[PDB]
């Protein structure tokens, strides 16, 4: 069910994860305001989903849902022990904690993906 | 955890506060969805929403009704659909003509045009005194703006409409029965879209609304302020009946091209005053219970109810719209006490839309004596021991009727992408 | 096989019956696309559709016309586009004035306003008798509703418009020449955009339509039912010419602001009756052939044709829209026989759109004498041996004029994803 | 060409498969009803295509066109022999035959991808 | 190389100069964004665009202004938006009534019969109407011969707000930084822009007002100077201050018609009567005219140069016009243009204003109470080329488009199609 | 920055390549015309982008940004030396040169991916 594990721990909510991806697009859906005021909502939903998918595509993880990646986890981003978060806290608490440092992670992650793309294609383009 | 590595999870249950546009959804079963009920299928989705389910464990969210915004969207919807409904019908500008009247109901006669504009004929019709301003009279609207007849096929029947969330959002609900309107609610559940909301408009009471399963609730943003309006919810409804025993008649007079205008003809039979009946046994019991509950928040003072503030009749009188006719009933006898009944009433035809913003409307008369049966469920009071005890019925914005329902609900935006540490490695 | 595993293919060619909104694409070659031809570039794709190809092998699908979607979509589109075309211009309400007429054409004179509203002048104009209802007369429309002049820059000429399927659908066609309209057509082919369809309106016969390559076709739901209308496609067309030899004249009279109105002036020269000419040899040959064909479906009975059902002139007569003028021709001389010619005709200016649902129109008069040369291609009949032999031309619905061109066509929705078994492993 | 093998056998229509998937988006394409009545069609076409692509991506087959999967083919879903369909039937007939049991297959696949990536996640993370 | 293979790069920086529809972004700071400034938030993005940056190295492309897109889209936007603004108000059709007038020669005192709130009753009213708006003792309003007027009802303000034009998703805007750019030919100093600096959509004939200068000395622009028909557009190195006034202390009265549907008109002139005039500093004006003559002497080889009076014709074409606080001027420019290679100009005002393209609907600008001033910066001139005849220049105008094509000269629109194929040593 | 390497050589602008991919969708973004004329722009922005991604999907390179293939480079497509373009020419100059022959090489890749798909599919099928 949708949001069926919104309160469970990080180790339990990480199961499935297909319900949260299927809902973001699907649904039931003279000149009248109903027209424009529904088409705007639909186009915003599509654009948000495509920004998310593109952002996954830049990191090489498109097609996957759980995607390992090469970027160190500096302890300054989390003083809490890294084996405790996975069976104690809810995902919301994690978002509240780590929403501060997001753009640093994304900016570093782009270049860390480039250091898997460029070298692998220079394996033959330069060799 | 010796040296961990970033991992990216997509489709993860996190959310934020939101600002979006909700879709209505009617709940009709027949061609009434196409008969323009204002909120007909011409407005939004026909029918058949999904049920409401998915209780969530251990979640906590901090609701608020006075900072809420769903009521704002719906008020704008109300005004927009009202204007859209009144647009493609008359336009009673020819009636701003000198009326000669003689004798509540004045018998007015006036010159008007037949289908040929060069020819004219006399017509007579009975107009209610509040709609007339001076043996020469004119309609009140000509000083302010042009009227617009609420032409037939347009019914004010308050059908329930469900508010459903667009793609990519969700709606959260509070199940705590004693939820006073603010503070964290733990028994949270998800709803695809809300229970049936009857969009009535009324003043000094609530009609056909939603009760509360537990005992009488009292809700206000800041009771220490003497201006904030209380919105009470009764544990059990009180049955009310209203009638207009006069057997009216309607006559149609044509104006210019193919175009009609209905007006009240002659009163067949005897004349009687439109009234309202409220069961006094239930009413006294409920008033006593509300007095008992109010005594908690104000520390051990006496509490009394007194006559309304007065002023404009719309603000100073309870007002129905049922049966296609607008009432204005006096509530003086209804509020008298401390911690059956018959109410006299008067009706109007020229109606300014009760936000005080929409253009004037002419409600056409309806033939035959009309009855109307409702449920009183909530009260709108305002706080005035000799003076803190007195409570006055209150009247005001259209929103206050509906913030009485859209208080359990919250709109959350979901952004499912989360970064977590673990022993991953590519 | 021993053991198999699910496999997923994308882009599979499978379809389902669909229900969608079809675009419209014009076929213009000049500025006429922007000059409002009702179906101009203001409401359709400009021009140049693709060709039609991709015959399919071994396919079979069950067509049907009498429950097809395209005809209702086109009907609603036609009504909406027409209503949008007539709204911006006048507003002929000032002419609901007492007319003094004397003497087919009555010379009516009336008072009207000049550019200054406080001043008036007399004007005279000739109005056709069917548009007048009583030495004092008024227009027929003032009883019913306000008219709107078909202001200039609008041309009723039926240009061809191609219908096309939106993104993610396809159009299927029947190539079987003797396709009687129902049951599985095997010679199926795909189409991007339909062939040119002329959206003409014309009762009791068909004009400028599409023939059939093989011999005469006959179509109906259930010939055992006496009520349904037969639609016949002729193997070859017959040539018909219509004229209004009177050399009319138009005069413009102004009303209020810069808001004119044209009317028929005086008849220069001599007066003559508008008439239509049909070649009698071709008509007799075609009528004999259709009589020969009809004997197959009704077993070896005699067959005859008789005068129309009568009633309203529009139902009881054949009407065009030639040169911006509307005709009503008597077809009694045409249908007289068993298993040249001149037809008298009368014209109108006040036209209710022939659904009876569209709003009133005043077709402006056109100067000079009109000629109108057309190809008749199909007939509309209704089955009445002494009584089963007689066939009565009939009509009244504009839908049947178009269900004779959109009979070959069906709309399909692709379902590209499909699952199949084979040897596999991830 | 588009729909150029709608009648051929399953083994013959399995060739190409680019034209029947490339056409689902492309095409030629004052307030007026033309605007709303065209934008609604556009948005519906886009949303249908994105639902198809997302459904292919949940199963791990995004980017592919022919994609093997690990779900057994119980004989009860087809009594007709499994080596005869590939050279006798047409895809239309196959869709008519199997459309009864489709949601079972989709439900099985939507979980049999999480089971697939469970091993990869545990190998590359749990170690 | 020995043997190479195709490689596909996505995100390549290549472009094709194309066509599109660009948004409009306002630059407001308060509820003025919701008070109808014609081009308010009701038709444009609210405010706060991004800065303009990312200079590009070694780029070159051929610009052009006289076949640009942005001018036509701006013109259609202006026409459609203005028309949509004027619809939801009167409709002064009741005023096509026989006006009895008797004459200060500019203002005629007219009286007429009109309806009160009861249509069956009538009363007399009086108002002063300007003589150009009247056509003959009997008089009627000018518009009744042509079409119905439409009062520019209050809460709409004609003040030119700066609006930024921001390109939609996918496209981008390119700019010329060459200071002496003459409108055509390849500009090397290129820099992309997210969206345009503030453009004041003013309207004015025979001169330019409040527009953008050029940092270097005076520029001269045209299609083909060898052709005499084309209009020259000049950007001044520095502005010259201009002031316009209407010292008469007018008054406004309201007369009601039918339903609650008013109509304002000029009452009685309190005090004394004076003629509206404009003031231009003659020192700066002579200096600037001399400099423009010096510049124009270069393109036309070593001839004398002079300036003569306007071509004449319609007063709108033959006179500089304004929109100053809801009032429209028509000032004579004869004294300005007299020379070779302070000042006071008499002016007249109108109330019945046709769209100065001649294509929009009639408008009635309501009178504004109190004496009104209007302070502006002249920045560009519109001339046409007529040594005895090639020396004389004539101010010219009439087209709305030429007033904006002086400002959108630097800009171009590019479509990005970033998918590129290249050869290199590859194998899947 | 966007278009920050529009003038540099082919081997210099080949770095990053995500500024040009992250911009093609993102941005700031009563019945009125301003409503419709924005929705017409937005839907053409997303539909143009999906047509690019779908075109990389058939070529097998969806998810990738730099993607090798198996279609040889006939010298007739370019007489200029194939090791000189990568450090002398601007990407625009490359576009103007080889835009003539675009639909040939596109058509080959449309099948040269389906070719190896069949061999991969027939490895087990
Ligand atoms: C109202 O007055 C009219 C005279 O104009 C008269 O015919 C009619 O009977 C009166 N009706 C009543 C109810 O007094
Ligand atoms: C009219 O009055 C009678 C008796 O008062 C009542 O029974 C009836 O219901 C009334 N008419 C309607 C429509 O309610
Ligand atoms: C119609 O009557 C008018 C008189 O009002 C006359 O001048 C005109 O000649 C007449 N025309 C015809 C055709 O009888
Ligand atoms: C007018 O009549 C003449 C002779 O009947 C005919 O030749 C001509 O074509 C007619 N005018 C038009 C426009 O058809
Ligand atoms: C204009 O004429 C009216 C008479 O209708 C008079 O009352 C008024 O004073 C006059 N005003 C002026 C400025 O002459
Ligand atoms: C009115 O005139 C005086 C003196 O001419 C001037 O100072 C004042 O600014 C004028 N009024 C306005 C609103 O500018």
Numbering used by the authors:
A (entry chain B): 497 to 525, 543 to 640
B (entry chain A), C (entry chain E), E (entry chain K): 31 to 132, 152 to 184, 190 to 309, 312 to 321, 321B, 322 to 354, 356 to 394, 412 to 459, ...
D (entry chain F): 521 to 549, 567 to 664
F (entry chain L): 523 to 549, 567 to 664
Question: What did the study's authors say about this model?
Answer:
A glycosylated region near the base of the third variable loop (V3) of HIV-1 Env forms a supersite of vulnerability that is targeted by antibodies originating from diverse germline genes in multiple HIV-1 infected individuals. Here, we determine structures of antibodies in complex with HIV-1 Envelope for all observed members and ancestral states of the broadly neutralizing HIV-1 V3-glycan targeting DH270 antibody clonal B cell lineage. Here we used cryo-EM to visualize the interactions of a complete inferred DH270 clonal tree with the co-evolving virus Env.
Based on these two early intermediate resistance features, we selected Envs from days 358 and 526, having both G300 and long hypervariable V1 loops of 18 and 28 amino acids, respectively, and Envs from days 836 and 949, having both N300 and short hypervariable V1 loops of 11 amino acids, to identify structural hurdles to DH270 antibody interaction. Additionally, structures of DH270.6 bound to d526 Env containing G300 and d949 Env containing N300 show few changes in the overall epitope conformation.
